[PDB]
C-alpha cells in the first residue's frame, strides 16, 4: 500500500457517472449508491479516470450492516482491462451528503484488492460545495500523539481535476453558460474577486463556532487542526511593517499605469469622434445635392 499521498485529481466523468448510477438504483434516504472507483495510483496524486456501480445494498436500520457482492468485482475488473488495461481499484465512491462512521468498516473490504490506501470520494447528488461538488478522503492508520489510541481515520486531501482535452471541449459544447465563476473580462473577474471574499467569510465562520463547540459541548481538542491555526496568525501581517508600506508604493505604481492607460483610451475614441463628424460633414452635401 502507498502511504504517501498529496492530492486527488478527478476526471469530470467520474462525478457525472455516479449521479447517473445513483438514480438508476433509485437510491435515497440513507440508501446510498456505492460503486467501485477505478484509476491510476501508486502515485501521490490519485488520478481517478472512471467509476462503475456494484450491486450494493445499504440498510437504513443499521449502516454497519451492508451488503457487498464480492464475486462481481473480479468479473467487472476483467472487462475494465478490455476497455483499458490500466484501470484498477483505488478505492470506492460514496454518493451521500457526508462522511459516515460505517464508511471506515466498508473501506476495509477494498484493501484486499488495492495497492494503495482506499479512496473515499463523496459524489454529492445535491451538488453542494463552493468549489467542486466532491470531497476527498483517503483512509490512513496512524498513532495519535494526543494520548489516544491508534485510529484508522479519513484524512482530507485537496481536490483537483485532470480532464482530457478531448472530453473538456465536450464540456464546453454541452455548456451554454458564458461563465461568471471563471475568468473573463473586467466585470467577470470583478465578480470572481467579490466571490472569493464571500467564500472566505463562510469558511471563517465555521472555525469560530468549532472553537466554541470544543470548550462548552466538549468536542475533541484536536492538536493537528489547531496547530495549522497557530500558523495562520504567524503568517498574518502586522501594521507598520516596511513590507506593508511598500504595498502603498506598489499601489501607486499600478494605478498610475491605469491612469495613463485610461488617458490613452480617451485619446483614441476622440479620433473616432472627429471621424464621425467628417462623415456627417460629407453627408450634408449629399443630402443637399439630392
Amino acid at each position: 500500500m502507498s502511504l504517501q499521498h498529496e492530492k486527488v485529481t478527478i476526471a469530470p466523468l467520474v462525478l457525472l457517472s455516479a449521479l447517473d448510477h445513483y438514480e438508476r438504483t433509485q437510491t435515497k434516504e440513507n440508501k446510498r449508491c456505492v460503486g467501485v472507483i477505478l484509476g491510476d495510483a501508486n502515485s501521490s496524486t490519485i488520478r481517478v479516470t472512471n467509476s462503475f456501480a456494484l450491486p450494493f445494498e445499504e440498510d437504513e436500520k443499521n449502516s454497519d450492516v451492508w451488503f457487498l457482492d464480492h464475486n462481481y468485482i473480479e468479473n467487472m475488473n476483467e472487462m475494465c482491462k478490455k476497455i483499458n488495461a490500466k484501470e484498477k481499484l483505488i478505492g470506492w465512491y460514496h454518493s451521500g451528503p457526508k462522511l459516515r462512521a460505517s464508511d471506515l468498516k466498508i473501506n476495509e473490504l477494498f484493501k484486499k484488492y488495492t495497492q494503495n490506501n482506499p479512496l473515499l470520494l463523496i459524489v454529492d447528488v445535491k451538488q453542494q460545495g463552493v468549489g467542486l461538488p466532491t470531497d476527498a478522503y483517503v483512509a490512513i492508520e496512524q498513532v495519535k500523539d494526543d494520548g489516544t489510541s491508534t485510529e484508522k481515520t479519513f484524512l482530507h486531501l485537496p481536490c483537483t481535476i485532470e480532464a482530457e482535452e478531448a472530453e473538456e471541449i465536450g464540456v464546453e459544447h454541452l455548456l451554454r453558460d458564458v461563465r461568471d465563476q471563471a475568468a473573463g473580462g473586467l466585470s467577470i473577474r470583478l465578480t470572481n474577486q467579490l466571490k472569493s471574499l464571500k467564500g472566505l467569510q463562510s469558511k471563517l465562520k465555521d472555525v469560530v463556532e468549532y472553537l466554541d463547540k470544543v470548550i462548552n459541548k466538549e468536542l475533541p481538542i484536536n492538536h493537528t487542526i489547531l496547530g495549522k491555526l497557530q500558523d495562520v496568525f504567524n503568517l498574518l501581517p502586522n501594521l507598520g511593517t516596511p513590507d506593508d508600506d511598500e504595498i502603498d508604493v506598489e499601489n501607486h505604481d499600478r494605478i498610475n499605469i491605469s491612469n495613463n492607460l485610461q488617458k490613452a483610451l480617451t485619446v483614441k475614441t476622440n479620433d473616432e469622434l472627429m471621424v464621425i463628424y467628417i462623415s456627417n460633414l460629407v453627408r450634408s452635401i449629399i443630402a443637399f445635392d439630392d
Partner: protein
C-alpha cells in the same frame, strides 16, 4: 478678535514658548491675563510652557468627527471600485 487670531497662528509656528514669549504675542501686559486666556482657549500650559501639538490634534480631530466620514478618509478599496464601474458603465 486679534488675541484669538494670533492664538490660532501659534499652533503652527511653535510647540514651545516660555511665559514671557506668550505674554508679548497675545498683546498682554499682565501675567495673570496670559494664564487667564490660556485656560479658556484650552492651552495646556504646564510648568510655564505650552504644548501646541496637543492643540493641533484637537482641531484636526474636530475636522474628522463631522459625519462625511467614509469619503473624507477615502478608502483604498473604494478607488478601485470607482475606476472599475466607469469602464463597465
Amino acid at each position: 478678535a486679534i488675541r484669538d487670531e494670533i492664538a490660532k497662528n501659534t499652533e503652527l509656528s511653535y510647540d514651545f514658548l516660555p511665559l514671557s514669549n506668550i505674554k508679548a504675542l497675545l498683546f498682554f501686559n499682565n501675567e495673570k491675563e496670559t494664564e487667564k486666556f490660556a485656560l479658556e482657549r484650552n492651552w495646556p500650559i504646564v510648568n510655564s510652557k505650552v504644548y501646541f501639538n496637543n492643540q493641533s490634534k484637537e482641531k484636526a480631530d474636530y475636522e474628522d468627527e463631522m459625519m462625511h466620514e467614509e469619503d473624507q478618509k477615502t478608502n483604498i478599496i473604494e478607488k478601485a471600485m470607482d475606476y472599475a464601474i466607469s469602464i463597465e458603465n
